[PDB]
Amino acid sequence: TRELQSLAAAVVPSAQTLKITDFSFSDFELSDLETALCTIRMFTDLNLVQNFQMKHEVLCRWILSVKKNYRKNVAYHNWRHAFNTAQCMFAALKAGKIQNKLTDLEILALLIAALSHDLDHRGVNNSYIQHSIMEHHHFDQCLMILNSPGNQILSGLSIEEYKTTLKIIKQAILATDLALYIKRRGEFFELIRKNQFNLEDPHQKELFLAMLMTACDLSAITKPWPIQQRIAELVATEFFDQGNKIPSMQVGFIDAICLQLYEALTHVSEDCFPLLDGCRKNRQKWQALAEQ
Numbered sequence: 001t002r003e004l005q006s007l008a009a010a011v012v013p014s015a016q017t018l019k020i021t022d023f024s025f026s027d028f029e030l031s032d033l034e035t036a037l038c039t040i041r042m043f044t045d046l047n048l049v050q051n052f053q054m055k056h057e058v059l060c061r062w063i064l065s066v067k068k069n070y071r072k073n074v075a076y077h078n079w080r081h082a083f084n085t086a087q088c089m090f091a092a093l094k095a096g097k098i099q100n101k102l103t104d105l106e107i108l109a110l111l112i113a114a115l116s117h118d119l120d121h122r123g124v125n126n127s128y129i130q131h132s133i134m135e136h137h138h139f140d141q142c143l144m145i146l147n148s149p150g151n152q153i154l155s156g157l158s159i160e161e162y163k164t165t166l167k168i169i170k171q172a173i174l175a176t177d178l179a180l181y182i183k184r185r186g187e188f189f190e191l192i193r194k195n196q197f198n199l200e201d202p203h204q205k206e207l208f209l210a211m212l213m214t215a216c217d218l219s220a221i222t223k224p225w226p227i228q229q230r231i232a233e234l235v236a237t238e239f240f241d242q243g244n245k246i247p248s249m250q251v252g253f254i255d256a257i258c259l260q261l262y263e264a265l266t267h268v269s270e271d272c273f274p275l276l277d278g279c280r281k282n283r284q285k286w287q288a289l290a291e292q
Ligand SMILES: COCCCN1CCc2c(Cc3ccc(Cl)cc3)[nH]c3c(OC(F)F)ccc(c23)C1=O
Pocket: 178, 217, 218, 220, 221, 228, 229, 231, 232, 233, 235, 236, 239, 240, 246, 249, 250, 253
């Protein structure tokens, strides 16, 4: 409660001051408190606080709840990865001009889902517990928090706005299962290959939203080389140390998973090119190392 007090008081610097509009944004120099402020600025500049009447104290308390329910002891899947996925959503909406293409409820759900999509993750090598099992648990945690007293940032919504928002949130979190991404991306590319991609179709809109969640989830792969190398470290710590081969593994994951995604995304809105570009520059660098 010491921490909610300092955060509820602080001034929220502008989007420009915080750099949360650059696809190149990094979080390494920021304290937890500063990522909270960045997160309030994301909600605010998306018009989410205005259009849905979010009480300042509840947003603050919601954000600290979410941060609280990521595990510090997990190297990569932690609050900072959740914060970075949201920042990328923000930059894709603003810098990448995708805001125009969506409604406010879609935007409000993508931001909440980006921040919540890995809640209570314990590291890839602790697949304990008791078709997207993890993602279902992530959404449960997310809903559980959205309902906690004092944390209900969706109280300003009507019952029908609320039910619509939770549907998207759930779809968005579940979309972060790379299995679903592999299952559904073929249709997405096909409709962009043939120039028939239209967002006004509901099934197509929902598919874009799933694809955008993956693009943000994986976006460490697009970052300036010294930033991406540091994350790549964290990914390796989690995968190996449960807390020479790597460069070529990196190139395989970029080719199998990332490049097409970011290519397709650039066709939808070419202001998302920094992501595709950042991904290529990283493939180049990793391949050079892969060749020793
Ligand atoms: C949400 O995550 C759920 C799991 C999906 N996954 C794992 C796969 C992955 C690789 C490929 C890799 C290479 C070497 C090792 Cl030892 C381990 C993995 N690279 C990563 C990455 O790179 C960029 F940070 F540097 C950023 C994110 C991810 C990965 C990522 O998303």
